[PDB]
Amino acid sequence: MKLIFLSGVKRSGKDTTADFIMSNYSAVKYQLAGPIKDALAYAWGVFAANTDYPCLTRKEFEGIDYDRETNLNLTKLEVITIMEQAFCYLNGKSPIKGVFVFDDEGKESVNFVAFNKITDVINNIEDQWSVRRLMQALGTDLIVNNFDRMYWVKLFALDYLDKFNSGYDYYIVPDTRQDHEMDAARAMGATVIHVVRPGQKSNDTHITEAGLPIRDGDLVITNDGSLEELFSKIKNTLKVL
Amino acid sequence: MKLIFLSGVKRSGKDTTADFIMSNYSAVKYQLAGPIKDALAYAWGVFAANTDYPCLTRKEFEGIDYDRETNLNLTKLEVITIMEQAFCYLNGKSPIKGVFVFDDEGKESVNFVAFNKITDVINNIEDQWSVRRLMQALGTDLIVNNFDRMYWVKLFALDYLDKFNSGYDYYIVPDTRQDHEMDAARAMGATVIHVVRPGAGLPIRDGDLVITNDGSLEELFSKIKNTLKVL
Numbered sequence A: 001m002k003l004i005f006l007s008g009v010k011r012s013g014k015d016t017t018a019d020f021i022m023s024n025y026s027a028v029k030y031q032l033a034g035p036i037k038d039a040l041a042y043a044w045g046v047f048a049a050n051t052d053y054p055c056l057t058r059k060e061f062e063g064i065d066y067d068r069e070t071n072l073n074l075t076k077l078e079v080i081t082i083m084e085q086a087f088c089y090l091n092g093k094s095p096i097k098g099v100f101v102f103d104d105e106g107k108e109s110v111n112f113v114a115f116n117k118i119t120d121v122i123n124n125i126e127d128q129w130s131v132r133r134l135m136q137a138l139g140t141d142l143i144v145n146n147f148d149r150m151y152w153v154k155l156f157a158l159d160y161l162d163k164f165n166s167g168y169d170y171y172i173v174p175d176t177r178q179d180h181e182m183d184a185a186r187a188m189g190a191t192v193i194h195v196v197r198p199g200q201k202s203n204d205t206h207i208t209e210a211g212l213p214i215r216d217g218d219l220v221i222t223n224d225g226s227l228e229e230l231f232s233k234i235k236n237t238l239k240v241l
Numbered sequence B: 001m002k003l004i005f006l007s008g009v010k011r012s013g014k015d016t017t018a019d020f021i022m023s024n025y026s027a028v029k030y031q032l033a034g035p036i037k038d039a040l041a042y043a044w045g046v047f048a049a050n051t052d053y054p055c056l057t058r059k060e061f062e063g064i065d066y067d068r069e070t071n072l073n074l075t076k077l078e079v080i081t082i083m084e085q086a087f088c089y090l091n092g093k094s095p096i097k098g099v100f101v102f103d104d105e106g107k108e109s110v111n112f113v114a115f116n117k118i119t120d121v122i123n124n125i126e127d128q129w130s131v132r133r134l135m136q137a138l139g140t141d142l143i144v145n146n147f148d149r150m151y152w153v154k155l156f157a158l159d160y161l162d163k164f165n166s167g168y169d170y171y172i173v174p175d176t177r178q179d180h181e182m183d184a185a186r187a188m189g190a191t192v193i194h195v196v197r198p199g200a201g202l203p204i205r206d207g208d209l210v211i212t213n214d215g216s217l218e219e220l221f222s223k224i225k226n227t228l229k230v231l
């Protein structure tokens, strides 16, 4: 099995490569942001539970025919509430450094110190709450920035370890957005492929919306033409490996 | 941080190699069996409390001025409760596939299938229960063979990633004893270094480094220094 980490800003063609590979080769995919979406979909269902709030499922968090920028009109309090349930869920996948979960009959809650950082981080955010802003808050503003910088790479490793000895030719991680995550991928022998559109950028100011450095060893597919030309560049990059 | 997995049989000089590196370089060390002894020591205190049993600290589980070959005279029934407690300890580190721990008023317990699975496994162990056997029972008869082949490597993966930005030059895992675990180690980018004596061990695959311990300690030291130079 070969471990491939793709890198590319929004609309660079990185997403097309990902899809080209998944359908023309024996490949298994792992999204670093997978568990983030899972944790939110579970937290939502718990929040919106017996409310009149829109029912948002995993498919909506996946953005499948749902716009994730759609303002959800949430208050910082609701959001804190959601973030706390998301944590309870995740703590169950893999322990988050400094978080404990307590139970009061189906009512899970995080320890005060962790509840306090969530509170503090959220109160400082003045953006509007979209499915997209909640993903960035959970993943980056909270977890990476304040609890465990390597948490999403860690859940990745647990998946990889269950899968490396299977019959797939490739194992693809398409959504890495932080440099330190690329660093771990590289330490682990991953082949990093950057899909680049000559002089281009993604409209998001999040650091999860910016472009990662090409370090040596990194391969690069320059998407400066037709789609057929992208497909050839991809077939030829992979044949190299 | 260079990830190194050491391989070698008893007396090959593999342990001497782990020591010399720990002593001479910026390195951190991780034992795949660490958690096994931590959970047994945890599950022990809990059990040997109730009873009129000896006191086994984490320092004896380590074999620190204690013989782990020693028979503790345990019933298959006490071994099973011990094991169920160790599973409760472990599950808090990383979920063991198909295990759920429920609190029973200051009594965590494992779901019934996991519980029964432990019962059947412990029930066919016709050996006498020493510390050394509790470790294999826990580590291999139970977890590796019946719950998750890769569970001890998973725990390593979590600690390794944690120490990732720590400024250590090497991360050494010296106690792998199973080949499937070395495969996992190679899938994570580890360099495998075997320490062999001239004239039944883990296989030497292509890409693995081999240090032949054929001379003096100091010749062994020199081979190590030059091997680390090349990674």
Ligand SMILES: Nc1nc2c(ncn2[C@H]2C[C@H](O)[C@@H](COP(=O)(O)O)O2)c(=O)[nH]1
Binding pocket: A032, A033, A036, A061, A062, A063, A132, A135, A136, A137, A138, A139, A140, A144, A152, A175, A176, A177, A178, A208
């Ligand atoms: N890969 C990754 N995504 C993150 C991280 N922290 C937060 N995210 C969020 C921000 C993105 O807009 C979102 C990606 O969702 P998606 O578009 O479905 O792949 O995940 C992180 O550490 N890594």
Ligand SMILES: Nc1nc2c(ncn2[C@H]2C[C@H](O)[C@@H](COP(=O)(O)O)O2)c(=O)[nH]1
Binding pocket: B032, B033, B036, B037, B061, B062, B063, B132, B135, B136, B139, B140, B144, B152, B175, B176, B177, B178, B181
């Ligand atoms: N590396 C490794 N060690 C294991 C595994 N299962 C059990 N062990 C234990 C049994 C040995 O007695 C022990 C070594 O402990 P020690 O003597 O404290 O260094 O490793 C396993 O899957 N991998």
Ligand SMILES: Nc1ncnc2c1ncn2[C@@H]1O[C@H](COP(=O)(O)O)[C@@H](O)[C@H]1O
Binding pocket: B009, B010, B011, B012, B013, B014, B015, B016, B017, B213, B214, B215, B216, B217, B218, B220
């Ligand atoms: N190449 C060597 N030359 C001389 N003594 C050695 C050599 N390698 C190992 N030793 C001895 O072998 C012992 C056992 O090896 P080990 O437990 O595998 O580390 C050590 O404690 C050393 O004193």
Ligand SMILES: [Mg+2]
Binding pocket: A085, A088, A089, A107, A108
């Ligand atoms: Mg909950």
Ligand SMILES: [Mg+2]
Binding pocket: B085, B088, B089, B108
């Ligand atoms: Mg317990």
